[PDB]
Design a protein around this ligand. Structure first.
Ligand SMILES: [Cl-]
Ligand code: NA
Ligand code: NA
Lengths: 159, 164
């Protein structure tokens, strides 16, 4: 019913109308979320910084994810993405951030979390919503659905 | 050598993993397409960790530590700016090798009259940096596609036994 391109167009219009700035941190989707947001005609007026990170080490060093958050909950959790989303919003001095962390596949987590499990955080002016989704399909399917969902949820919150 | 981007990343993956080389990227033009290409490789986690995308001059300055004077003297689209971007992202990611791209994908050019399609590249390979400037024909998507391909082909060339 909405393609990713339709979502980014609607989000762009909403964000620019509200004078708001978005940033993203991706640990799963490989930059596909960044790519969708830069595909917009006027991406420059609402989106500046996108980060892609794979390792726990990078999350700790770049996004200030606490080592004990990772110890208690792993990188794929709503707690980790809450920290990722808060850090990147500060780093970018943005109004809104999205953080995604998941197991796109084919392997799952070491703790046996199913492949296709993806955690999201949306931080809007310091207010954070989180979700954990389980997606079917191969890695590219999971990534496509994760990107779509992260955009669709933000659009909904900005009702 | 008439290679798709998928072929280039597969060859680059093998060149890098052979020596435990770690790669990082900073893109200001290609919108993350370079990161996506590198993350699509089957063994991406063995050689690629951090990718940064930035649009603005201020973000290059604050996040990548590009000097204000560099931006004023040479603009963001310059070999001086991408050299600084490549040095910083390499340190931020603790990587062996970095690629930085900054260009005018189009349709608009630079306020200084630099044509749309002008793209600057830096490759920092364990502390030694090569830079180049290219003018790519086509619309914004064409420029981005060619910039991604060129950034990878040149790195693979720099790491080739055939180089002289
Ligand atoms: Cl200086
Ligand atoms: Na994938
Ligand atoms: Na551009």
């Amino acid at each position: 019913n909405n393609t990713v391109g339709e979502l980014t167009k609607k989000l762009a219009s909403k964000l620019t109308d509200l004078g708001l700035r978005l940033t993203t941190a991706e640990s799963c989707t490989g930059g596909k979320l960044s790519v969708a947001l830069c595909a917009e005609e006027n991406t420059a007026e609402f989106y500046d910084v996108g980060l892609v990170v794979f390792s726990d080490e990078a999350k700790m060093r770049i996004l200030g994810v606490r080592p004990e958050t990772l110890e208690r909950f792993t990188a794929v959790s709503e707690q980790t993405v809450t920290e990722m989303a808060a850090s990147i919003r500060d780093i970018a001095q943005a109004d809104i951030s999205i953080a995604i962390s998941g197991y796109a596949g084919p392997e799952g987590g070491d703790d046996g979390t199913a492949a296709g499990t993806v955690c999201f955080a949306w931080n809007i002016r310091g207010e954070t919503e989180t979700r954990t989704m389980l997606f079917s399909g191969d890695c590219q399917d999971v990534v496509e659905k994760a990107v779509h969902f992260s955009l669709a949820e933000l659009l909904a919150a900005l009702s």
